[PDB]
Design an enzyme around this catalytic site. Structure first.
Site, PDB file in Angstrom:
ATOM      1  N   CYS A  86     -24.842 -18.535  71.203  1.00 14.55           N
ATOM      2  CA  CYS A  86     -25.629 -19.222  70.191  1.00 14.55           C
ATOM      3  C   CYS A  86     -25.712 -18.453  68.875  1.00 14.55           C
ATOM      4  O   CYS A  86     -26.375 -18.914  67.950  1.00 14.55           O
ATOM      5  CB  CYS A  86     -27.051 -19.429  70.712  1.00 14.55           C
ATOM      6  SG  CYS A  86     -27.246 -20.776  71.895  1.00 14.55           S
TER       7      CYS A  86
ATOM      8  N   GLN B  68     -22.017 -26.024  77.143  1.00  8.34           N
ATOM      9  CA  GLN B  68     -23.093 -26.350  76.196  1.00  8.34           C
ATOM     10  C   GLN B  68     -23.435 -27.827  76.231  1.00  8.34           C
ATOM     11  O   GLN B  68     -24.612 -28.207  76.253  1.00  8.34           O
ATOM     12  CB  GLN B  68     -22.708 -25.952  74.762  1.00  8.34           C
ATOM     13  CG  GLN B  68     -22.352 -24.483  74.569  1.00  8.34           C
ATOM     14  CD  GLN B  68     -23.575 -23.588  74.544  1.00  8.34           C
ATOM     15  OE1 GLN B  68     -24.244 -23.446  73.507  1.00  8.34           O
ATOM     16  NE2 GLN B  68     -23.872 -22.964  75.681  1.00  8.34           N
TER      17      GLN B  68
ATOM     18  N   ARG C  98     -20.511 -37.099  56.260  1.00  7.46           N
ATOM     19  CA  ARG C  98     -19.694 -38.078  56.959  1.00  7.46           C
ATOM     20  C   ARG C  98     -20.173 -39.493  56.794  1.00  7.46           C
ATOM     21  O   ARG C  98     -21.362 -39.792  56.857  1.00  7.46           O
ATOM     22  CB  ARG C  98     -19.569 -37.740  58.448  1.00  7.46           C
ATOM     23  CG  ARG C  98     -18.142 -37.448  58.895  1.00  7.46           C
ATOM     24  CD  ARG C  98     -17.167 -38.573  58.536  1.00  7.46           C
ATOM     25  NE  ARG C  98     -15.822 -38.377  59.088  1.00  7.46           N
ATOM     26  CZ  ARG C  98     -14.728 -39.041  58.705  1.00  7.46           C
ATOM     27  NH1 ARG C  98     -14.779 -39.967  57.748  1.00  7.46           N
ATOM     28  NH2 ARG C  98     -13.560 -38.772  59.284  1.00  7.46           N
ATOM     29  N   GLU C  99     -19.193 -40.359  56.595  1.00  8.97           N
ATOM     30  CA  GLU C  99     -19.413 -41.691  56.088  1.00  8.97           C
ATOM     31  C   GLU C  99     -19.530 -42.669  57.278  1.00  8.97           C
ATOM     32  O   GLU C  99     -18.675 -43.548  57.472  1.00  8.97           O
ATOM     33  CB  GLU C  99     -18.255 -42.032  55.122  1.00  8.97           C
ATOM     34  CG  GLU C  99     -18.680 -42.791  53.891  1.00  8.97           C
ATOM     35  CD  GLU C  99     -19.195 -44.174  54.215  1.00  8.97           C
ATOM     36  OE1 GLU C  99     -19.810 -44.788  53.321  1.00  8.97           O
ATOM     37  OE2 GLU C  99     -18.987 -44.652  55.349  1.00  8.97           O
ATOM     38  N   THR C 100     -20.590 -42.513  58.080  1.00 12.79           N
ATOM     39  CA  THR C 100     -20.731 -43.319  59.292  1.00 12.79           C
ATOM     40  C   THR C 100     -22.035 -44.136  59.366  1.00 12.79           C
ATOM     41  O   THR C 100     -22.937 -44.013  58.535  1.00 12.79           O
ATOM     42  CB  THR C 100     -20.486 -42.485  60.574  1.00 12.79           C
ATOM     43  OG1 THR C 100     -20.285 -43.378  61.674  1.00 12.79           O
ATOM     44  CG2 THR C 100     -21.647 -41.534  60.892  1.00 12.79           C
TER      45      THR C 100
ATOM     46  N   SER D 264     -22.858 -31.289  66.650  1.00  9.43           N
ATOM     47  CA  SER D 264     -22.211 -30.693  65.505  1.00  9.43           C
ATOM     48  C   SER D 264     -20.953 -29.970  65.944  1.00  9.43           C
ATOM     49  O   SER D 264     -20.804 -29.568  67.097  1.00  9.43           O
ATOM     50  CB  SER D 264     -23.175 -29.769  64.788  1.00  9.43           C
ATOM     51  OG  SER D 264     -23.719 -28.815  65.668  1.00  9.43           O
TER      52      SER D 264
ATOM     53  N   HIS E 196     -22.017 -26.597  61.840  1.00 18.47           N
ATOM     54  CA  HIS E 196     -22.746 -25.579  62.619  1.00 18.47           C
ATOM     55  C   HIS E 196     -22.019 -24.239  62.500  1.00 18.47           C
ATOM     56  O   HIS E 196     -21.175 -23.903  63.337  1.00 18.47           O
ATOM     57  CB  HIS E 196     -22.857 -26.011  64.096  1.00 18.47           C
ATOM     58  CG  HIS E 196     -23.749 -25.142  64.946  1.00 18.47           C
ATOM     59  ND1 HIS E 196     -23.651 -25.097  66.322  1.00 18.47           N
ATOM     60  CD2 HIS E 196     -24.751 -24.293  64.619  1.00 18.47           C
ATOM     61  CE1 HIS E 196     -24.557 -24.267  66.807  1.00 18.47           C
ATOM     62  NE2 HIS E 196     -25.230 -23.756  65.793  1.00 18.47           N
TER      63      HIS E 196
ATOM     64  N   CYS F  64     -31.882 -21.605  69.246  1.00 16.90           N
ATOM     65  CA  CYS F  64     -31.296 -20.855  70.344  1.00 16.90           C
ATOM     66  C   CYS F  64     -30.829 -19.481  69.825  1.00 16.90           C
ATOM     67  O   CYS F  64     -30.466 -19.346  68.656  1.00 16.90           O
ATOM     68  CB  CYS F  64     -30.089 -21.644  70.893  1.00 16.90           C
ATOM     69  SG  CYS F  64     -29.279 -20.835  72.286  1.00 16.90           S
TER      70      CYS F  64
ATOM     71  N   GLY G  42     -28.838 -15.437  71.118  1.00 15.53           N
ATOM     72  CA  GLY G  42     -28.035 -14.673  72.057  1.00 15.53           C
ATOM     73  C   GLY G  42     -27.492 -15.542  73.166  1.00 15.53           C
ATOM     74  O   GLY G  42     -26.748 -16.494  72.917  1.00 15.53           O
TER      75      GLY G  42
END
Ligand SMILES: [Cl-]
Ligand SMILES: [Cl-]
Ligand SMILES: [Cl-]
Ligand SMILES: [Cl-]
Ligand SMILES: [Cl-]
Lengths: 359, 366
Positions: free
Chosen positions: A89, A123, A189-191, A214, A315, A345, A347
């Protein structure tokens, strides 16, 4: 002895992997941001780079993990899962907590915390467990992911990020390296709700997609800290103070739900409650982490990740602590509000929480 | 989907000096031998095999990108730069994680392990903190020399009496010559290499590592080669395989240490784990507190006032070496075997972890 305050905080724009920042070595991108945070302080002050007494950088993100390689080297069966605790993380807020503490201790009067993400079990699975645990659906995360994109778009349209970003010069890269300046976050972003409804889950039986998680991105950030009166003596303006901090162990099987505990504990240390907080920055690696955190604490969601977060912005995990502090501070100043909570988050199976107050 | 984690086996390799008896092994060979030994030991009197293990978690391992960046942007060389990392190892984290995953019902069988080794191809920040910790509590040069002498004596007694025989898995390693070149020979290594004839006079002659310091080479531990592993199971799964539960975790605590006194964490982590367990220090039969620096242990002792005859009874890292990356498993392994040898019930294990964290764990022999 000392009284630590933030005097300057800056971040690079955030580039996509193989995008606008990819032509920089990790050391060059971090270096640019270290220098920018000093140069900003030096614009109307006496401060120079040689006045920095300590720089502390967060750990760098990294199967070929030694536990697995050992297990295979001894001839042991290949189906057995093996991992090694490392920097999954990033160190979250640790560098900033250490720099501020070393100033409080009177060890140093000037310090920089910084982080970098570049070309230097699992993850999604954890994030899906965290969703099932508290009934978070595919529709819930799509709503949140749409809102992060909208807020980031609005934020960029209104110039909200102009103060906090240090533009970075980078090579053309891509197809031809022969050719010999980046201002904007590339991940925007174009969503739409419909677009997001079309996406395929990343794991079979999952609710998260590429639009509600991300992607790992290129970025660096740094925060320059000083003892209050040393800042004043050099003609620099104290901008924020840490009200309280917490570093806590997360649940082994719900390791990304740490913000629930670290938020609880830092609020308790401050003698505060969720409703006292004007601005929250909680890292959006996964939409379910934020929605899980929100279901326990029930904040006003209009105060959570106001300018978007990592789902829209990218990220850059190695600099997350400094990136979130940087964004929270500038949004407190833009709106002239007083208190922000920053949680994420850290370590491996740790989480950090920090409450800051604008001054 | 709620398990009850218990230790069923724990083993550690002998601890070698830097460039000593284990140095010719790659890190992955040394750790792998210990992972395999902990499985083979459990399989001697049971149905268990290696393929029944569901998860293995190893601690973090071990120039700064922060400094390289600072230099590449042209910035001043005198400015100190560091990177939060794996300075103390992850201490007890791998064992806490394996046990937690069993308690959560995610796995029934797991191994926590750690490794310290260096490819053939403690820092000044640490000694500085250790000297700050000494001055803060009036701990003198004479105090730490008395403690260092006693660690060596205890370790020597323990070795002479064979106290470490059950716990240690002997490890086959390349023989290296005077020039640190391999001869082609491989020998089974049985014994901790770091033990040395020590006297008060000898220790009194040593030169402090830092100008104005109290610690020397004889009252601080050197980085060493070693690995350790602990095999954990859900108790019913242990019984179904014919294994006997040996230990369980009574309480555990993880605390953030003082940024300027980052090695003094054991004081807080001990306080907190005792509080969680409803216990006091006098309830604890055996303590293992890692001896990276004598001042850390003496600082801890001045606050908690244990009976020092219960503290690091078989010696600690000053005498035995400091294989940093496996410290958590090494201390749990040594504590468990000393509870079993003496038929006592409770041990407290405390140490530094990550960077500026400390863990405390109370275990019970069952
Ligand atoms: Cl950071
Ligand atoms: Cl190696
Ligand atoms: Cl031997
Ligand atoms: Cl370990
Ligand atoms: Cl330690």
């Amino acid at each position: 002895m000392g009284y630590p305050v933030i005097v300057e905080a800056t971040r690079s724009p955030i580039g996509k992997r193989n995008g606008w920042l990819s032509g920089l070595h990790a050391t060059e991108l971090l270096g640019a941001v270290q220098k920018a945070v000093v140069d900003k302080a030096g614009i109307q002050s006496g401060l120079h780079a040689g006045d920095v007494e300590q720089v502390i950088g967060g750990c760098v993100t990294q199967s070929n993990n030694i536990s697995r390689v050992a297990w295979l080297t001894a001839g042991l069966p290949e189906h057995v899962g093996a991992t090694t605790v490392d920097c999954q993380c990033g160190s979250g807020q640790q560098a900033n907590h250490l720099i501020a503490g070393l100033i409080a201790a009177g060890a140093i009067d000037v310090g920089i915390a910084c982080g970098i993400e570049a070309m230097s079990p699992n993850q999604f699975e954890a994030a899906e467990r965290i969703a099932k645990r508290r009934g978070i659906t595919r529709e819930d995360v799509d709503v949140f992911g749409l809102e992060s994109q909208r807020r980031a778009q609005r934020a960029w349209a209104e110039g909200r990020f102009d103060r906090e970003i240090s533009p970075i010069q980078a090579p053309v890269l891509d197809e031809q390296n022969q050719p010999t300046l980046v201002f904007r976050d590339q991940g925007l972003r174009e969503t739409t709700m419909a677009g997001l409804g079309e996406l395929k889950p990343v794991l079979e039986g999952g609710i998260h997609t590429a639009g509600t998680s991300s992607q790992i991105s290129d970025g660096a950030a740094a925060v320059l800290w000083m003892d209050e009166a040393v800042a004043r003596a050099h003609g620099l303006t104290p901008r924020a103070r840490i009200v309280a901090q917490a570093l806590v162990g997360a649940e082994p099987y719900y390791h990304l739900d740490g913000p629930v505990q670290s938020t609880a504990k830092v609020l308790e240390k401050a003698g505060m409650k969720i409703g006292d907080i004007d601005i929250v920055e909680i890292n959006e690696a996964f939409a379910s982490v934020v929605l899980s955190w929100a279901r326990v604490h029930e904040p006003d969601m209009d105060r959570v990740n106001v300018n978007g977060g990592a789902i829209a912005l990218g990220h850059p995990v190695g600099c997350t602590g400094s990136r979130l502090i940087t964004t929270a501070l500038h949004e407190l100043e833009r709106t002239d509000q007083s208190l922000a909570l920053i949680t994420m988050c850290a370590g491996g199976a740790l989480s950090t929480g920090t409450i800051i107050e604008r001054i």
